[PDB]
């Protein structure tokens, strides 16, 4: 993984996207682009560039598992990195999650080492 790769953060409360972005930054990642919701994300990734999508669970109007589904049927997209990100782990989610095509699943509050983590294990399950 390069460290341009352009990140797409997903959530209804501009402080938890603000937190997601800067441990990106703490990372050494500093691509990163906003969205308020499913469809404000779909709105965006369809002007194309994304590498990677870090989604909340909740979000009104198109939430998480939606936004996901999306992305996996699109032609074009249908292999982006999803991380999901959670208040709660439930086994149904992480499995309803895992079948939609998740790359992987947190549970927040999290801190930059478990954030690294997360995206260590993505980058090698999908080769990256």
């Given amino acids: 993984a390069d460290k341009e790769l352009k990140f797409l953060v997903v959530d209804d ?4 996207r603000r937190i997601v ?3 990106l930054k703490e990372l050494g990642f500093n691509n990163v682009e906003e969205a308020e919701d499913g469809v ?4 965006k990734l369809q002007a194309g560039g994304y ?3 870090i989604s909340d669970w909740n979000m009104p109007n198109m939430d998480g598992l939606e936004l996901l589904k999306t992305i996996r049927a699109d032609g074009a997209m249908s292999a982006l990195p999803v991380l999901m990100v959670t208040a ?6 992480i499995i309803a999650a895992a079948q939609a095509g998740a790359s992987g699943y947190v549970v927040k509050p ?3 080492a478990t954030l690294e983590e997360k995206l260590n294990k993505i980058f090698e399950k999908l080769g990256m």
């Fill in 13 to 16: 409360f501009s402080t938890m």
């Fill in 110 to 112: 999290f801190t930059a």
């Fill in 51 to 53: 590498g990677f999508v």
């Fill in 21 to 23: 972005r800067n441990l």
């Fill in 88 to 93: 709660e782990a439930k086994k149904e989610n």
């Fill in 40 to 43: 404000d994300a779909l709105n």
